[PDB]
């Protein structure tokens, strides 16, 4: 089972990553943003960095992220 922690501002998401089409980085930041809405009725649109570094839209999750990694989530707009 694989989860990555993502801080969006001053919370902070245990989201997990289930199992066959692979989840991009996208789909990730998707995640945080809902989790995020549910929160505060706010849906920001986030780009992710894990350890300052900016992740890839596009890229897969399993390719630049391991279970239990913490991600840095930035809102660049407010959709």
């Known amino acids: 089972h694989i989860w990555v ?28 943003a809902q989790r995020y809405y549910q929160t505060c009725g706010l849906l920001p649109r986030l780009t992710l960095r894990k350890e300052g570094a900016l992740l890839a839209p596009q890229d897969l999750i399993p390719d ?16």
Do not use: K
């Not at 289930?18 to 989840?23: A, G, I, K, M, N």
């Not at 630049?64 to 959709?79: G, H, K």
């Open 64 to 79: 630049v992220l391991q279970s239990n990694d913490e991600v840095l989530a930035e809102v660049t707009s407010w959709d």
């Open 5 to 32: 922690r993502v801080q969006v501002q001053d919370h902070l998401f245990l989201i997990p990553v289930p199992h066959s089409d692979t989840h991009s980085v996208a789909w990730l930041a998707e995640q945080a």
